[PDB]
């Protein structure tokens, strides 16, 4: 076994955010929820994938705490990923996976 790959961060950038969560999926949309981390936050990164393929990305308010990603396909294996942004940079992902 090889050990895990760390995520490299700026310091004074922000933890994960807390508590995330899928609170409601369709067939072609899934909604995130989850709380700020401590400190000043610019905005999130909300990144998404089909498992295994190339990496989508929308940058929301550092205000938000839920967003809903549309247009997605049906049935399938979805992985997404937030990280907190501010002033130094990106911080640590916090994961989930869903299926539509």
Same mark, same amino acid.
């Given at each position: ?15 994960? !955010? ?16 989850? =709380? ?13 994938? *089909? ?5 989508? *990305?929308?940058?929301? !308010?550092?205000? =938000? ?13 979805? =992985? ?12 640590? !992902? ?7």
């Amino acid at each position: 076994m090889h050990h895990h790959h760390h995520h490299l961060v700026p310091r004074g950038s922000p933890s994960p !955010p807390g508590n995330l969560r899928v609170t409601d999926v369709t067939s072609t949309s899934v909604t995130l929820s989850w =709380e700020p981390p401590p400190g000043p936050i610019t905005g999130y990164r909300v990144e998404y994938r *089909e498992a295994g393929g190339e990496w989508k *990305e929308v940058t929301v !308010p550092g205000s =938000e705490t839920s967003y809903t990603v549309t247009g997605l396909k049906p049935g399938t294996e979805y =992985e997404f990923r937030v990280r907190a942004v501010n002033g130094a940079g990106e911080g640590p !992902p916090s994961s989930v996976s869903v299926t539509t």
